[PDB]
Amino acid sequence: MELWLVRHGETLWNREGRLLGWTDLPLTAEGEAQARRLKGALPSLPAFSSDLLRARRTAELAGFSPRLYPELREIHFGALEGALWETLDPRHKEALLRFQGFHPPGGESLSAFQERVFRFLEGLKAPAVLFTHGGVVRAVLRALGEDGLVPPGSAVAVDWPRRVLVRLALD
Template sequence: MADTGGVEIWLVRHGETLWNAQGRITGWSDVPLTERGEAQARALFPLLAAERFDSVVASDLSRAVQTARLAYGEPQRHLWELRELDFGGLEGLPWADLAEPHRVALLAFEGFQAPGGESTARLRSRVYGFFEGLAPGRHLAFTHGGVLRLVLRDFDRDRFLPPCAVVGLDWTARRVLFVWGEEGLDGS
């Protein structure tokens, strides 16, 4: 994105955790990266190191901070606003053990709220509130799969992305610039 006074955001999903590998619902639990997750984060370094960012931030959960450190460097701030959805009573459960109504609602995403957890509307409010407060420039944010899915759904590109996927956004124009994941680069 040319420097037009707009806001460009690169969102990075954290690397694999044990709960990801086990298919467990992971929200606000502070689960560290696996060795594979660390390797995934290090593999992003050549891509991200070649870029210049005006700020580098991460969710305050260790999996996002650890990914940032391995993939780019120490984030300037650790922010709760960039956390995953709070799954409340569903936290830590294997996907296969979720009641059918919870699985259906979570796949639909919009309007979802786990028992004792956070709604997708609240997730949108806190994440977008942070994005709206960003100064013009390029920003790198290490976050979670639910945040990437939220944004992509709102931009008509609903996708589940793997650990260490990267989504580039022209936030000012509300446009997806690219999606990078296991399949490689997918430009808009």
Template sequence: MTLELTLVRHGATDWNGAGRWQGWTDTPLGVLGEEQAHRLAARLAGHSYDAACSSDLSRAVRTAELVRPGAPLILDVRLRELNFGQFEGVTTEDVLHDPTYHDWQRDPWNLPAPGGGESLRGVGERLHDWAQELPDGQVLAVSHGAAIRALLCVLFGWPSRPVPGYVLPFAYQLAHTSVTRLSRKDGRWTLHTYNDHAHLE
């Protein structure tokens, strides 16, 4: 038997548009995010899933509800975004002037964000624990940008290193409501599609 896992990043929020870091802050979808989710729903309308899961943060929950209207939804805190600690609600422009940010950026994969935040490794490992528990079948899950990429780093050994001009150590971007498809067979994971956002083009 095989698990077919479809990972979706939530739709955009007003904080995304303002360059403000959300993390565990519970921000709602913006108008653009609602439109993105409707477009994804139309794209996935002919596909059936055995289960639908979501982070418990409202921007993810709302995305899942729009993509799979009326379907039962399993909420799991392990699908949450990276906890940015003291940087929650701060803009990228402002955080660049904070010396504690630059200290964290030396190794954000292993160092927790200051002020009670998480490391990216910790995020990847909690999502990995969640994914390993999934039963075989077709599963749709809505999560967050850093969280999905951290999971892929854990599953496939992708590198995590500083990228000039970007606040997270990922050289690969992930669009809002993009689709990333994986499968697990006999304990082995395979990546089939990454950052597919054709419905937005």
């Protein structure tokens, strides 16, 4: 199934290097610019989006009117929300880097995050554009055997659950 996953535009915590999960931060001016550039670069397909502000706003500026689904939200970092990556406990750092055995206090384990994301994708019956988050795009890319890091406001098209089709980054 052809699916286009879009990483929302940047927020302040991108430059600050802080774990950004369910903390509802707004897009930065440049983040909105990245979103506007996506308009015309994404296929005209039904759209779905994380209900968090930064995702909804990206979808809007990109020219879409998505159906909102919490299932497309970034992973819930719990007590780790806002934590500087730099000073993150080695155990949490490694769990996130290797993408496994991650369980933040008061938040979502990586396992639950994946189950939530994949169950949503499996429910999609036709091609669509999904405005979501870095962690969601990463989970999908890793599950397809690839490096899951993509720039803010960029997109990746995949033939779910078989392969990555294209990665699109605009300057």
